[PDB]
Structure formats: structure tokens, C-alpha cells
Amino acid sequence: LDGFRKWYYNAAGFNKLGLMRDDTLHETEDVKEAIRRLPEDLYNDRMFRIKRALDLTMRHQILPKDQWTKYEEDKFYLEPYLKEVIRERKEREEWAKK
Amino acid sequence: LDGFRKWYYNAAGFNKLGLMRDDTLHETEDVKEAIRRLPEDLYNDRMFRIKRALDLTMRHQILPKDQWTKYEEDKFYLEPYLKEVIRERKEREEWAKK
Amino acid sequence: QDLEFTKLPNGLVIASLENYAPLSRIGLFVKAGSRYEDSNNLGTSHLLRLASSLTTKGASSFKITRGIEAVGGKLSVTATRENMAYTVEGIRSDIEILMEFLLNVTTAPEFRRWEVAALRSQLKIDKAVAFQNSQTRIIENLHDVAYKNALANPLYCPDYRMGKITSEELHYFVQNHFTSARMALVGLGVSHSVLKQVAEQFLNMRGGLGLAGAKAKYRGGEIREQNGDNLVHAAIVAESAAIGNAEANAFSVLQHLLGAGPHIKRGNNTTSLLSQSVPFDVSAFNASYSDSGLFGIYTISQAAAAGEVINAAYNQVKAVAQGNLSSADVQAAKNKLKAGYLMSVETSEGFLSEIGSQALAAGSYMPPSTVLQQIDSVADADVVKAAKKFVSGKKSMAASGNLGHTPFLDEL
Amino acid sequence: QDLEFTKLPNGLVIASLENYAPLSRIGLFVKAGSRYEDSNNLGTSHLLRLASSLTTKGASSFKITRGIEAVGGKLSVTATRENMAYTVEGIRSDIEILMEFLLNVTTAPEFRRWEVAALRSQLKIDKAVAFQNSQTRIIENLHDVAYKNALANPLYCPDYRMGKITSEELHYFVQNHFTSARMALVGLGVSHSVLKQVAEQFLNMRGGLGLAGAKAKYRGGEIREQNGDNLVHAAIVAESAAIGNAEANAFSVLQHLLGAGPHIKRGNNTTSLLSQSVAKGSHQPFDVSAFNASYSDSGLFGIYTISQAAAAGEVINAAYNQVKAVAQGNLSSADVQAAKNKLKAGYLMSVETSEGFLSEIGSQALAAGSYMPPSTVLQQIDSVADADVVKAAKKFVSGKKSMAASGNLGHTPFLDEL
Amino acid sequence: PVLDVKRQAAARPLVATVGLNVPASVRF
Amino acid sequence: PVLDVKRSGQAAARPLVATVGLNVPASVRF
């Protein structure tokens, strides 16, 4: 399962643009709240990575293979911050339900 | 000529709405610059007179005859301020011409 | 029943009174006022005061706010330059979760950075609302010119420090001043036992004496802020007695002799030696902190009259410094002071604050009765003495308004 | 030729020098600084300084601005706490209409209310730009804590007074301080005669002595400003000599002995006794100098320090200790001779430029009504002698001090500790 | 600026007060 | 707020002198 997940990570292809996994999340309301709660350096790296991926998609290029994002290396930075947004979101929802 | 001017002042009919002569001027750029240079009390009386005239025109009424604006009493307040706007305006124009 | 002071080994002074009130009130008192900051973390106590509804380890901000409003209870934070007090009140059937919320807020905050970044605008708004009146600004200016380091720190955050207070400063302030030896948990309308159980599930984790603060040093000087207003607010104070001395009682008797607020609506407060020294408003400002206290006149007069209003007021105190007083006036001052104390403790939240303060200050409860006889201890000469202290000690003057005819200290 | 002076019977001073310069400069100097306001019209001189391009009785704002820019001339306003100076400069063939514009601005303003209402936002912007650096705020704070009434008034308008300054206050200030007995018209590159003709068509109608100002009173004290800057700025001054005494020359020699700015770029200003006394104990970056500001009734002399907040204390103490050494006679005659050479070279380089020369003549005019040739001064500065310097020092070392501090002041000492 | 929601002597030290309830102010 | 158009460290040793006028530059010197 670990090797097949690495193969699927190579087949997804966002590592060839230098992106992380959390860069590829669709910005819903909860995702934008989690992005707003990021520290300044992580937010700046995320915006630069997104801008570089957009530039590479503009020129129809990819990064060189040494510059790709290694599956093992990818960091799920937004995840911790996101869970909270969802948790808080649900708590609020439940309160209203009841 | 003085009596015929009073007769024309009665025939114009803005005194029946309580307006002054300078309230009836069309607000061009020079007129709005002259209105902006008015003191606060004169501006507030002008805005109240215009609002009262608009309300009277809404109800299709006029003021009682004792409350009309006597030709002799009308004050050309905006005039002094206006001349300047025109003078300044012309001076600037001339400078550009030359 | 009667208050039960139990100084737990952790220094926490548990105090309880069960009077079977329908609404019961539980407060927690910490020696963590604005005097414990230095020049590197100014305004941290203001953000800590405004950060009582933040996410805690045990309850989120949403859970705290909706749970306190669900039972209709109230959570408030009152802060002086020495002490902070977090108070909850509500129906007896909901004070268990009210103590859960309050003790979570006191003991285990999180101080998330996005929450404090949202709170700094509220800090600016709260400071503007607080400085909408001239008395607050002139007392803050008076403390800033009167003291050097400790009590000169403002209750409200400075303008440059907004946008600069971080989560680490709040965490450091809490970890250095919210320790068990500086805390008293006081409950009216609750059983003492429960206070103790909540005092072990919480209030026991953080121990120690906490960071000791610096001794406050008097400086003097004058800060005159021309603000343009017609009224020239002016406070002239000097160093006085601290908390824990009979000279503090003498200074309290001295402000009630000189005048400490009108008793009649639209009265002229006839008796006040000051007022009668002769629109104006002349009183006497006395505030006593643990290491030092300030006494002195505080006058609000038309710009022009400031000259006489202030001088005349100063001259009246000099008369009291020369022994020119009557025993009936001192007896009336003692009656006014003791009636003010009894009406201050007649309300429930004032009673809870008093017990709280006494706890942190002396660890003991002083029955209202005891005080009455101690105030009586103050005698005429004692009052005179405190006066001469003010009349001689270096003065500190905070003035605001149109100060073209407001005198200086070397002229005063 | 040389400088040539006439005092007109209405009190106006006329000074001219014709050196046949290609660009000629004409200035007009009025004793109408910020010291002549009181608590009811604070900041009026700032709006008067910024209101030089307003509509006058004789030329509109558009005509003044487009006519000065049409010939490429320059109109500027410089203001101290005592004096205001309106200066125009341009080609000799256009200085007739330049004097028309300048004398209309000085003598016959209109001060229309919509124009000053538009100018108050520029007043706020100018104050923010001026207080972008720490030296300006700390000197304004130092004057405010040092004086009681006259010289304590700020050069820049207070925040509450913006939106409150009216046309009537400007008219009252002009009618009470822009009179002929307080004015000198100084022209480099022009004939004296024309100055006089323009001095009769203008500058002669307002001829009272005007409204006399109050005597400035010293107060002492200290005002601090905790604002979290990286560097602590601190000025500690005391009362000193006024304009018109030899003790002012002694205090100028004393600041050039203690240190009055670097002469070498990236130098350590080695000689400055202050700089040496700080640098022998502190390895942090610093900037210590001597401050002297003397006005016609009173003067301020002291020390100015910029330092890291942490060392702010002992550095200030070190600087103070150095002045105490000068108060104990611990000085050498070669050091005083070098201080005199530095002071006289600074004076000659200040008057070597055209606008500095016009300002100097102007100031001298208003101050003493007479022109003092650069040479004369040189021998008077020489008059100052070693003991004299020591004397001024003891004045500072003893007189009540006034302290303005700003920055992270957790380790900045107080006056009773200093 | 507007002092949020806009609209006597000082004898006792100031005391800030804030909390869940909407009101918040200082008293001498 | 932005101080209009933003930008000295050299310590003042002489009195200040505001300066403004028709020309665009405007500042103070010690």
C-alpha cells in the first residue's frame, strides 16, 4: 500500500509542479479559514509555490526531476489548521441543530 | 423697469415656493464650486429651502402669500461667491490660451 | 453563615460563604495587574483582560460563549494596577459548568495567534471608549508622571504596542503571574467544599510565587496636555501610605474630610472644606497600592478659574496641615468613610471583590465590624499628619485642557 | 561692493548687496515665530507657514503659483521659534515680479476660509512627514518640557488644533506680528534702491511695533515617550545664555569642544570628548553630540544621545560625566583652540552659500539691526577664552535640567538618578 | 475614531472592566 | 497613516527650522 501510494503520488503529477498536497485543496470556506490562520512564512511559501505552478502551467513545462516534491517530503501543513476549522464548524452546527 | 421686474418676479413663481433666485441656478461646475465655498449656515438654509420647495411641488401646493419671498427681500448670496469662481475660471482659461 | 478562609498549602486562599442566595457568584483573584509588566511587554495585561473569551484547553471560544449565555450567566474581568479578578455569576444549578468555564479560562488558555490578531482591533476600540472621558486620561497621566517603573504602567495598551503583542508574551505573563500562591478563589452562594474540589482539579497545576515585581519608585514631575477643551482637569498628588498601615486609614479620613464626592444630587457638597474653599468640581484623590499610594487634590474647573480653583484647594489642605480643623468635622468624615465602606460591601459583587482583595492582600478576612473600630482608631492628629505629608512631599501634576492660566508646580 | 543698510522711519530694515550674481535672492524676515502664540491659537504659525501660496490682494493663488513657476523662480518659507523668513530667488530679469509676489504674500493676504479648510489636511501631512524622524519629536518634546509659555510652543500644529484654526486667527496673527518695526528686507544680487521702492509700495503700511510677546520662563522637568523604537533618543539640556552675550559665544565654543557633528564620513569623530568618553566604555553603536539652541531671551544647552536601549543608561551617564570634567577645569588649551577653529570654519561655511548668507544678514537685521562682518565675528569668537568655556559648562552642570526621552526606556535613567 | 458607540470626579484609582456582557468601561 | 510619502540617525545638535514652500521639497534641519 505504501509503494502503491507513492506510485499514485507520481501519477497525480502535482509534485512535478513543485506543489504540496495541501496546495491542491479547493478553497472552500473552511479551507480559506484554515489558510487565514497560517503563519506568515508558511503562507508566503504556499503563495510562491502556487504562483510558480501557475507559471509552469502557462509555459506548459514542469520542474526538473531533482526539484520535484518527494512524496515522503511533502508536508501536510494546512491539515492541522484545517481540522480545527472543521471541528469548530461542526461544533457550531451541532449547537444550532440542538 | 423696476415695477415690471417685480411683475416678472411674481410671474416666475419661485417666490411662491419660498425659494431665492440663487437657489434656482442650474448646478454647473462653477455653481457647485460657489456652493462649496458657502458658509455653513447659508448652505443649510439653501438646502432646507430646496427641500421645502421639493416637498411643496410633491404635494402640488405653494406657500401662503405672507410666506412668499418678497422680490425686494430676496438676497443674492451665491452671486458674490459665484463671480469669483467665474473670475478664477477665466483667469485659468486665459493662462492656458496663452 | 460566614466566610471560610482556607489558605490551601498552594497559597490559594479558598474563601466561601453559603447564604442560599438565588444567584451565586464565584470569582478568582490573581496578583497580575499592569504593574508586573516592564517596558518590553506594555499593554499585555489589557489584552489578557480582553482575552477571557478565547479558546481554552477544555472548551473553545464558541463553547464558552454559548454555554455562559445558554444559562444566562455572566463572566466579567475587572483589573486594577495590582490585581485581576475573573468573576462568573448565575443560578446555583449551573455554577458547576460556570466553574468549569472560569477555571479553564484562568488555568489553561491556549492564546492562538489568529484569535489575538483579531482581538487587537477590539483592544484599540476599548481604549478609545475608555479615554472618551477626561478623568481616565488624567489619572493615567498622573500615574505615569508620579511613578518611575511599576505603578506608572498604564491600564490600557499604548498606541505603538497595538499590533505588536504576541501569543508568547501572553503565555509568559500567564506562566509568570498566574500561580497558586498569588490566587484566591472566592464564592458567595456556594459550598466551601466545591470550591476546594475545583481548586484541586484546577488552580493546583500552576504553583510557585511567580515572578516577583519591582518596587515602585516615585519620580514626580508634571505632564500638561493641552487638549483644547474648556474644562481644565488637573490632578496634583504626592506620595502617601501603602496598603497595610494606619496612615492609609488617616489618608482615607483625610479625603473624607476634604471631600470625596457629593452625597446629594445637585448638592454643592457644602461641607467639603475644598469645595467650600471656593462652575467647578474639586475633590480629593486617594489611591493606595501595596508599596505606595497617592493622595492629592483633583479639580475640574473652567480654564480661567483653574488658577484659583487649584490654588484655593491647595491652600485649604495647607490649613489642614496647620492644625486648622474641628473634631466634629473629623467625626463626620469618619461617619462618611464608614458609611461608604458599608454601602460598598452591601452589594453582592462588591462583597465578593472585597473578600477577594483582602485575600490577596493579607490572606485574611476582616469583618466589616473590625474595620469600623480601626477607622475609629484614626484620630484627629493622625489626619493632620497625613496632610503634612502631602503638603511637603514632591508633587506630581497631570493637567489637561486649555492650560494658558493653569499654574505649574514651582508656582503652585 | 559691501553690504548697505537703511533703517526706514517706519522701522523697516533694508539690507542690500549687489554682487552681480546670475541668480539673485530676496528674502523678508519677520519676528513672528511660534513663540508669539498662546494656548488659544496654537499651530497658527504652522498654517501661516504653509499658507504662502494663498490668494492675496493683488494676485490669486493660481497667478502666484504659475507666475513663479513660469520664470522658474523659487518661493520658500523657513521658520524657527522666533523668526519667519519668506524667500524668493530667480533670474535678475524676473525679480521685479518676484518682489511683487513676495511683498503681496507678506503684506496683503486674504485668508479665504475655503482655502484654509483645504490647507488643514496638508498641515496634517506636513506634520507626519516632519515627525517621521525621532530627532524632531525629541527636540519638540525637549522644548515643551524645558519651557513654560513662550519657547515651549511647538513648531508644528497639535493634533486637536487641526480643524480648529480659522481665518480670523491667521488675520489676527498677521495684524499683530507682521508690522514694519519687526521686518527686514534683505537682497543679494539686487540694487538697494529697488528694495527701498518696494519697501514703500509695501512694507510701510503696517508700521506698528505690533504685539509684544511674553518672556520665556524655564520650568525643568522630563517628558518621556515609550514607543518601541530600536534606538533610544535622549536630550538633556539646561538653561543657557541668550542672543547678544559673550556667554553665548562661550557655549558655542563649549559645544564645539564637546562635539557638534562629524567632520569625516564614517569617522568616529575621534576628538569629541563626549564621543571619546562613550567609546572608551561602550562598544555598541551610538551617536552623542552637544545641543545648543539660543533665542533672544533664553537658551538651551545640553547633550543629545542616540544609543541602544540597553546601554542607554551608562552612555548618557558617561556623556554627563564628561561635561562634569569640563566643569572641573579638566581641559587643554589646544582642545579649545581646535574647538574655536571648528566653530569659525562652520560659521564661514554656513555663510559661504547664497541662501545661508541671505539668512544670516536677515537674522542679524532682526536681532541687532546691524550687520556684523564675518571678520568681526572671528575676533569675537577668539575673545571667548578657556575659563569662559568652563564657566558655561558649570552653568549646564548645575542648572535645572530638562529631559526628553523616546524609545524603549526600560534602562533609561531619570533626572534624579542622572 | 468614532469611539465605537459614543455617548464627575476622580477620587479612586481607575478600574478596567470587560467581559461577555456588551457593556465595558472604567470607574474611579 | 502612511506618512504620505515615506523616506536619518544623525543626532540633532542645533535648533530646528521647518521649511516649506512652492518648491516640492519640504523638511527640517537642526
mmCIF file of N, CA and C in Angstrom, chain D residues 135 231-233 258 262 267-270 272-289 304-309 311-312 314-316 318-319, chain F residues 9-11:
data_model
loop_
_atom_site.group_PDB
_atom_site.id
_atom_site.type_symbol
_atom_site.label_atom_id
_atom_site.label_comp_id
_atom_site.label_asym_id
_atom_site.label_seq_id
_atom_site.Cartn_x
_atom_site.Cartn_y
_atom_site.Cartn_z
ATOM 1 N N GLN D 135 14.532 62.664 15.925
ATOM 2 C CA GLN D 135 15.177 63.876 16.414
ATOM 3 C C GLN D 135 14.193 65.028 16.517
ATOM 4 N N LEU D 231 16.232 52.391 18.649
ATOM 5 C CA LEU D 231 17.217 53.235 19.306
ATOM 6 C C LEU D 231 16.531 54.167 20.295
ATOM 7 N N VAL D 232 17.196 54.400 21.419
ATOM 8 C CA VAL D 232 16.736 55.354 22.418
ATOM 9 C C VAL D 232 17.360 56.708 22.105
ATOM 10 N N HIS D 233 16.511 57.719 21.943
ATOM 11 C CA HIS D 233 16.930 59.105 21.794
ATOM 12 C C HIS D 233 16.697 59.823 23.114
ATOM 13 N N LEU D 258 32.876 69.828 22.981
ATOM 14 C CA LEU D 258 32.258 68.550 23.325
ATOM 15 C C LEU D 258 31.943 67.708 22.096
ATOM 16 N N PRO D 262 29.979 65.075 13.032
ATOM 17 C CA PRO D 262 31.194 64.501 12.438
ATOM 18 C C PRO D 262 31.708 65.330 11.273
ATOM 19 N N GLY D 267 33.541 58.607 10.101
ATOM 20 C CA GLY D 267 34.523 58.827 11.143
ATOM 21 C C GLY D 267 33.897 58.426 12.464
ATOM 22 N N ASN D 268 34.664 58.505 13.543
ATOM 23 C CA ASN D 268 34.146 58.138 14.852
ATOM 24 C C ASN D 268 34.122 59.499 15.521
ATOM 25 N N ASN D 269 34.393 60.551 14.756
ATOM 26 C CA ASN D 269 34.534 61.875 15.371
ATOM 27 C C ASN D 269 35.421 61.723 16.639
ATOM 28 N N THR D 270 36.674 61.388 16.362
ATOM 29 C CA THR D 270 37.550 60.973 17.456
ATOM 30 C C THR D 270 37.665 61.992 18.613
ATOM 31 N N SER D 272 35.786 64.486 19.799
ATOM 32 C CA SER D 272 34.667 64.810 20.674
ATOM 33 C C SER D 272 34.881 64.182 22.027
ATOM 34 N N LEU D 273 35.056 65.014 23.043
ATOM 35 C CA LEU D 273 35.303 64.498 24.373
ATOM 36 C C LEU D 273 34.188 63.544 24.719
ATOM 37 N N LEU D 274 32.968 63.893 24.334
ATOM 38 C CA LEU D 274 31.836 63.027 24.584
ATOM 39 C C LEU D 274 32.034 61.701 23.881
ATOM 40 N N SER D 275 32.226 61.746 22.569
ATOM 41 C CA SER D 275 32.393 60.523 21.791
ATOM 42 C C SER D 275 33.513 59.654 22.346
ATOM 43 N N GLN D 276 34.622 60.271 22.765
ATOM 44 C CA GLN D 276 35.717 59.515 23.370
ATOM 45 C C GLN D 276 35.305 58.888 24.699
ATOM 46 N N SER D 277 34.588 59.649 25.536
ATOM 47 C CA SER D 277 34.181 59.147 26.844
ATOM 48 C C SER D 277 33.143 58.045 26.737
ATOM 49 N N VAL D 278 32.277 58.097 25.723
ATOM 50 C CA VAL D 278 31.371 56.978 25.497
ATOM 51 C C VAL D 278 32.121 55.780 24.930
ATOM 52 N N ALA D 279 32.974 56.004 23.925
ATOM 53 C CA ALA D 279 33.608 54.909 23.202
ATOM 54 C C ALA D 279 34.655 54.177 24.029
ATOM 55 N N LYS D 280 35.169 54.789 25.097
ATOM 56 C CA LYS D 280 36.086 54.056 25.959
ATOM 57 C C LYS D 280 35.383 53.033 26.849
ATOM 58 N N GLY D 281 34.053 53.059 26.924
ATOM 59 C CA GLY D 281 33.338 52.125 27.773
ATOM 60 C C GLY D 281 32.289 51.279 27.077
ATOM 61 N N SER D 282 31.752 51.756 25.956
ATOM 62 C CA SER D 282 30.656 51.091 25.269
ATOM 63 C C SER D 282 31.058 50.775 23.836
ATOM 64 N N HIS D 283 30.907 49.509 23.446
ATOM 65 C CA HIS D 283 31.211 49.064 22.092
ATOM 66 C C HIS D 283 29.982 49.016 21.191
ATOM 67 N N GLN D 284 28.811 49.353 21.715
ATOM 68 C CA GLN D 284 27.603 49.399 20.910
ATOM 69 C C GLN D 284 27.626 50.628 20.002
ATOM 70 N N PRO D 285 26.871 50.604 18.899
ATOM 71 C CA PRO D 285 26.704 51.826 18.098
ATOM 72 C C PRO D 285 26.006 52.925 18.886
ATOM 73 N N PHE D 286 26.459 54.156 18.672
ATOM 74 C CA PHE D 286 25.946 55.299 19.416
ATOM 75 C C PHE D 286 26.149 56.558 18.585
ATOM 76 N N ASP D 287 25.549 57.646 19.059
ATOM 77 C CA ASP D 287 25.762 58.967 18.471
ATOM 78 C C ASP D 287 25.510 59.996 19.561
ATOM 79 N N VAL D 288 26.579 60.583 20.093
ATOM 80 C CA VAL D 288 26.497 61.552 21.178
ATOM 81 C C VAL D 288 27.029 62.885 20.675
ATOM 82 N N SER D 289 26.250 63.944 20.874
ATOM 83 C CA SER D 289 26.646 65.281 20.459
ATOM 84 C C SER D 289 26.174 66.288 21.495
ATOM 85 N N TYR D 304 22.877 65.422 23.609
ATOM 86 C CA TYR D 304 21.948 64.633 22.821
ATOM 87 C C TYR D 304 22.584 63.275 22.571
ATOM 88 N N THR D 305 21.853 62.204 22.875
ATOM 89 C CA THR D 305 22.360 60.847 22.745
ATOM 90 C C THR D 305 21.381 59.991 21.960
ATOM 91 N N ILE D 306 21.920 59.185 21.049
ATOM 92 C CA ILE D 306 21.207 58.079 20.429
ATOM 93 C C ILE D 306 21.983 56.814 20.750
ATOM 94 N N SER D 307 21.308 55.802 21.271
ATOM 95 C CA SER D 307 22.016 54.597 21.652
ATOM 96 C C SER D 307 21.108 53.397 21.691
ATOM 97 N N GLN D 308 21.694 52.227 21.884
ATOM 98 C CA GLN D 308 20.891 51.036 22.009
ATOM 99 C C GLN D 308 20.176 51.146 23.327
ATOM 100 N N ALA D 309 18.949 50.660 23.392
ATOM 101 C CA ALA D 309 18.172 50.829 24.605
ATOM 102 C C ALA D 309 18.913 50.317 25.810
ATOM 103 N N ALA D 311 22.145 49.963 26.589
ATOM 104 C CA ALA D 311 23.260 50.757 27.091
ATOM 105 C C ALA D 311 22.845 52.184 27.330
ATOM 106 N N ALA D 312 21.631 52.517 26.924
ATOM 107 C CA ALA D 312 21.173 53.889 27.054
ATOM 108 C C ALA D 312 21.535 54.493 28.393
ATOM 109 N N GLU D 314 24.236 54.057 30.932
ATOM 110 C CA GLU D 314 25.586 54.470 31.301
ATOM 111 C C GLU D 314 26.226 55.358 30.243
ATOM 112 N N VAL D 315 25.853 55.166 28.970
ATOM 113 C CA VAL D 315 26.268 56.056 27.882
ATOM 114 C C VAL D 315 25.879 57.494 28.189
ATOM 115 N N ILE D 316 24.610 57.698 28.572
ATOM 116 C CA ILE D 316 24.138 59.012 28.999
ATOM 117 C C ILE D 316 24.953 59.490 30.187
ATOM 118 N N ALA D 318 27.964 58.512 30.992
ATOM 119 C CA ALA D 318 29.323 58.783 30.542
ATOM 120 C C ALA D 318 29.409 60.157 29.912
ATOM 121 N N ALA D 319 28.406 60.496 29.083
ATOM 122 C CA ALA D 319 28.374 61.803 28.445
ATOM 123 C C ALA D 319 28.251 62.896 29.488
ATOM 124 N N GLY F 9 19.025 59.257 11.583
ATOM 125 C CA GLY F 9 20.023 58.813 12.540
ATOM 126 C C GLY F 9 21.031 59.804 13.074
ATOM 127 N N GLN F 10 21.312 60.846 12.304
ATOM 128 C CA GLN F 10 22.251 61.863 12.787
ATOM 129 C C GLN F 10 21.610 62.654 13.885
ATOM 130 N N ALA F 11 22.282 62.722 15.017
ATOM 131 C CA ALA F 11 21.694 63.362 16.164
ATOM 132 C C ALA F 11 21.685 64.911 16.110
#
